[PDB]
mmCIF file of C-alpha atoms in Angstrom:
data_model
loop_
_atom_site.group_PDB
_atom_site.id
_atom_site.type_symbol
_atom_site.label_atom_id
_atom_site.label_comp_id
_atom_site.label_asym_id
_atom_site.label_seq_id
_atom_site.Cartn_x
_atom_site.Cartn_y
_atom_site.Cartn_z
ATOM 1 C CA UNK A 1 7.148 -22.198 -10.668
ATOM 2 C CA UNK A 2 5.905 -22.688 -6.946
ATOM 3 C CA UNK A 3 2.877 -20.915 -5.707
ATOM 4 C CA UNK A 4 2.770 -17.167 -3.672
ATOM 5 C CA UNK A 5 2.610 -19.107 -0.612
ATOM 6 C CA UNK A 6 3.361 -15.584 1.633
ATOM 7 C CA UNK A 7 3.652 -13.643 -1.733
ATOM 8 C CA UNK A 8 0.922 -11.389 -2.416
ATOM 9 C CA UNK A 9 0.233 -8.096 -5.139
ATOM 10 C CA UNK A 10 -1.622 -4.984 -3.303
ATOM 11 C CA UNK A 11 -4.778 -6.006 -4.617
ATOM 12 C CA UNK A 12 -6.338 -5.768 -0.545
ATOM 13 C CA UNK A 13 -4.678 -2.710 -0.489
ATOM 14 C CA UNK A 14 -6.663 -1.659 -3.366
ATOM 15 C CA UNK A 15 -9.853 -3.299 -1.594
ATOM 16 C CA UNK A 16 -8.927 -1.401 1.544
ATOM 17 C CA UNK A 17 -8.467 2.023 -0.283
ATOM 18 C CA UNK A 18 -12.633 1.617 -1.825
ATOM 19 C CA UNK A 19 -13.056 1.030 1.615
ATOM 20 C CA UNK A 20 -10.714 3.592 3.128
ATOM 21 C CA UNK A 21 -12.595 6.258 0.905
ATOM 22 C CA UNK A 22 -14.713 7.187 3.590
ATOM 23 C CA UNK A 23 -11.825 8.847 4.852
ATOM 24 C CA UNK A 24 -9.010 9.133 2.160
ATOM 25 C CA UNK A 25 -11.388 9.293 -0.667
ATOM 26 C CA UNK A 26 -13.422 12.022 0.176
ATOM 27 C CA UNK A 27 -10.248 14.024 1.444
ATOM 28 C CA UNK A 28 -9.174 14.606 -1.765
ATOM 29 C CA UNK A 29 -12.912 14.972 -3.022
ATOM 30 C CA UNK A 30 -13.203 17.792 0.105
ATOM 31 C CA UNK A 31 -9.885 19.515 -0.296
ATOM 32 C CA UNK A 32 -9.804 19.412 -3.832
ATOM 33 C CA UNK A 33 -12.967 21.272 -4.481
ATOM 34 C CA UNK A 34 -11.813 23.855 -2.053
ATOM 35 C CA UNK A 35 -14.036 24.296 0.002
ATOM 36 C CA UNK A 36 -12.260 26.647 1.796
ATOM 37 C CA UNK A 37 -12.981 29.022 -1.075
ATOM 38 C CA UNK A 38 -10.331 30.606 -2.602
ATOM 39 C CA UNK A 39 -12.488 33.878 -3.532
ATOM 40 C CA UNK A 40 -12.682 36.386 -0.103
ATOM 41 C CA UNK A 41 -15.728 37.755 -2.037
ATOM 42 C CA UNK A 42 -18.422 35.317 -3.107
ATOM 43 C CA UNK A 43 -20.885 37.646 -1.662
ATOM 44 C CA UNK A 44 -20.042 40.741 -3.766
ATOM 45 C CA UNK A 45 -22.410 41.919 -6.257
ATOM 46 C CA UNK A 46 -19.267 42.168 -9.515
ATOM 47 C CA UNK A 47 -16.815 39.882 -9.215
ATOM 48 C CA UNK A 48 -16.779 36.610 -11.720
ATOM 49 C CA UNK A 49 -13.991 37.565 -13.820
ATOM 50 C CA UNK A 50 -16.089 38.709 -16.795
#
């Protein structure tokens, strides 16, 4: 009973956040890809694991 006059769910927020991926999005995209590289190698001629 009796409407969410100044009640509201986090539905912006979750508007906001598809919007916010930009930044916050791609951050996890970015560091979780690592992009760093873990590896020192890479260039090395054996070195894969196998």
């Amino acid at each position: 009973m009796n409407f969410g006059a100044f009640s509201i769910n986090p539905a912006m927020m979750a508007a906001a956040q598809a919007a916010l991926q930009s930044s916050w999005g791609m951050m996890g995209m970015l560091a979780s890809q690592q992009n760093q590289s873990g590896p020192s190698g890479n260039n090395q001629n054996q070195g894969n694991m196998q």
